[model samples]
Target chain A: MNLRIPWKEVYYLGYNMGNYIKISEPELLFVLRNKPQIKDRLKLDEKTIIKEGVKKYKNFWEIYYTVKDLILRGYRVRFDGFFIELYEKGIIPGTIEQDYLVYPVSGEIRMTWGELLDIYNKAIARKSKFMLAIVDSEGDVTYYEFRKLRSN
Target chain B: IGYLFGNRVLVDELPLIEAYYLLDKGELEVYEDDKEEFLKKCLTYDERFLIRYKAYKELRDKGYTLGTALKFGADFRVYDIGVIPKKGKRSEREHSKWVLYPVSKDETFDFYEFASKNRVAHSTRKKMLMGIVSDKIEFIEVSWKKP
Candidate 1:
């Protein structure tokens, strides 16, 4: 069995875009779509824009969003796409410097060493997939990304 | 579901078996013919169960309550503390994955004492403590039996 690093989802720094996303399982297998169930949530949609990670490679992404609930009313979204990289030396604080980067950057978010270790350990599983389900203040939601870290 | 409480009554090993069986009804129930002996062994070892029970009494005596997370250890673990560099700048040295040695017997005694006094069980208490104390949970997991 693969050990999963449990995170409370309260520490995503300034990336308010996907604040409400909570990844309950390390390896999630489900089907999602604009309606309720897609052809295969495990496989990516052909129109996927940003692509990274094994699930995207295998074409699978499904997530249940829990947030404002007003806009979502009741809908499940498939992970359209996502990208993530390690912070420099694995210690990227939410300092002012990292707040304005445009492109993908490598940095750890601000959290306890224990939390960092948990996330790092979870990232070490070569076959495992990391996910983020996004829900916004307006309740508009989406499946942000399904990918894993390629460690150095 | 709540009658088996109170007293320094002589424990029946079979009750231990019955206890486990009552708790878990998987198809594995047929294999528990030796529950009595198993429970008896648990009693003799002064396992975490006994320690926690007494601890609870002690705490209640002080008008407080006790709660704990599950803790356990790896059967055989080689913790990778971090990487070790062979040389400087250009020579791409091997990425180090250090393995930690088995915990000292003294340390084990401390852990066993802490776990028992707190009413921790081989089932949950051990797993929790190991998570916090061990460097990293690598190739092994704590193994145990109710007995």
Candidate 2:
């Protein structure tokens, strides 16, 4: 909430390759209550913009609250192709290595054993810690850290 | 088969899976009930009975020897092919090569839940085996990848 932050001038509208919404460098967040202003003033519909958020992260509709909680706690966030990358408080997004690559999952969605392993291995190649963020039906989230174990 | 005492061979009671294997092979019969009745009763006693048995029977047919592994924190302890640990005259006392858990095709699990199993098996120097049973049974060996 920077006071000098231009309200409507720099809002990435109908552009941005990743569809990231930037308000003081924040990306891809939408509001329902105040969205009417965006609809008329910015010429962006709530449904389509929100749909963009959901499409940016395939399970964004189910996982938005998890992202919201992190931002609320002062952690910076961004969306990689299959993961929600989180940076610690006060760190510039992408300036340093991400702290976690959280894979959004829920009972409502399906993931095979192989697919889960593929993501786990991808995190290894990405050199970031893998996390599973399970969004329950109530929109609450449980976080589990995924680590590789060494066995002879 | 039974354990040996100082001067006696103490006959051992069979687990239902072992007895069921013998029953299906026409080597044992129960006078208390019909085979179908016994089968249904096993399912009644444990709804996962058939799935566990299917997992057990397939591995046994493929030359693996299995034993109850509840104390080892899994469904079964599986030996390599043709190695009988529970046999007579002091069979070289080797650890089971794999600790197995039976999963139905329709069942589910979490990564932490599986990692917990893999940790225990690896701690005991054995690999973790996931036996999935449906119309057929298949084995998925789970080992930790250090990356």
Candidate 3:
């Protein structure tokens, strides 16, 4: 029940799709602490990990890069691949990577053309990547990337 | 080698590692130098997938898991719970509840065909399911069952 207690150990994670998403160590323990009443600790049925997990992330890129990081570290990445619209749906970059045009990581890494675009666009700023007009998902295009930067 | 798009996992099931593909759209059928061999590989047994299959199988086999196999692709089901209060004093209140929720697991086995996928195969699934059970068992010891 002590959230401060760090249960650090190499864990063998099982189950459908619930073990390794966004539930932090402390949060996981808190949930598990009450697991007796909670039939499914993964809460796989609620499917909250994706819909809700994104909010936990400071930025969509945080989650995106984290997945890349885990895969690089040799953890098998499990998630709903279709969740791209969250970032790709809107062009306005906010705390989430979905806000910007993602420049995906390429080379050694294997990915689809679409996925590659998502990652690459998210990484490099549109202004830097393509100085031309900004293209929205709906096909409405504008050249905002070349616009002047706001004074801090 | 495949990167994640969102919360979901997208795997390159095709033989060409260069060609990234989703697991369940039936696209693993592409990149087939050997047709028969490919189908055989697709259905080939995998401990990781079989374990998931067995869990659902066991639940359905045991009859405790809700949902009919006909409506849902698999017999397994997920249930949701919410609280509702009674306006009248004479009416009784229901504390906890649940409703049938459906879920689908990628049955695609192409990932296991590659030797790379098997590297940590033995540990991943078992460890995750074990964590779930251990968490629950630990919880039962401390909490009281309600009516």
Candidate 4:
């Protein structure tokens, strides 16, 4: 899977000019291989850094696959980092039929309770269901819905 | 007899498996000569140690040699008895048959939390099994199939 960013939308979003750069998995590995700074930042051993890059490579594809499927299903999907905003248009102008805050899990899905609570709070503030989506090696996406256990 | 190397007790393959199988028949003594102290230290070493130890013992008794699965967040990586790797040999490289994640029956995890682990096992070409420790031991194989 490749890492993709919206190039065209950047202009409309106040950026003067932008170029879309879709980084292929191998290209990413090549950059990491030549760049010692990136390796040092990750603090991974020499033998393990390659695997770490591969893991992130798989995650990018999973996110792309999930977004593609959702768009094909007539749902508008927007991505901001790891957060996915999905919306279903309604007959009324500016009206929303369904809106969801989706957090994609790419690898090693470990999160502390406080982190989860923070996500849950953000979702609640946005008036959406907090959804966790995971993509497997086969590009299969599985989604689980979670609600806040307690409210402050 | 088990030799203590720092906090870990190392026992020969024969004695380790034998003691695990016949817990009452054979007694495991620490080389330092403090069986009770060793047992107490081991039991309280880590909060999750007992659960991991249970899974380790179960796999060992079933003729599967086990190793660490820290990368996959599983309890153990199991191999066939005669397939153990020999040190410093090119042909000694062998993939384990299964990666096991053991948890108590009451243990609950976010689906996403376990899904990543299962994915890693699949990527490494190993079958993933969840060993459920409860009143009755249960083994569940986990897989993600595209529809």
Each model's backbone clash number: 24, 1, 35, 0
lDDT of 2 at A134: 66
Off by over 4 Å in 4: A1-140, A143-152, B10-27, B31-37, B80-93
- Supply the TM-score for candidate 3: 0.17
Predicted candidate 2 versus true structure: per-residue lDDT over A22-120, tens digit per residue: 431113343333244544555544556565665455676545666655665667666554677878778756567989887767656654554555677
The better candidate by DockQ, 1 or 2, is 2
What is candidate 1's lDDT per residue for B1-147, written digit by digit as tens?
312332122233333323433334432332322245434544664444333333233322343322222222221111122322334662432221111112221223322232232233233222211222233222112222120
Question: How much is A110 displaced in model 3, in angstroms?
Answer: 14
Which TM-score values does chain B get in all models?
0.22, 0.82, 0.21, 0.73
How good is the docking of model 4, by CAPRI class? Answer: incorrect
Q: What is the lDDT of candidate 1?
A: 0.27
Q: In candidate 2, how many Å is residue B66 off?
A: 0.2
Among the candidates, what TM-score does chain A have in each? Answer: 0.21, 0.70, 0.21, 0.51
CAPRI category for model 2? incorrect
Give me the iRMSD of candidate 2, please: 7.1
Put down candidate 2 lDDT per residue, B35-96, tens digits, no spaces: 68557656766788888999888888778888888977788988877687866665544566
Distance from true position, residue B82, model 4, in Å?
6.0
Instruction: State residue B1's C-alpha deviation in candidate 1, in Å.
Output: 31
Cα DockQ of the candidate 3 complex: 0.01
lDDT of 1 at B101: 18
What candidate 3 gets wrong by more than 4 Å, as runs, is A1-91, A94-96, A99-152, B1-54, B57-65, B81-147
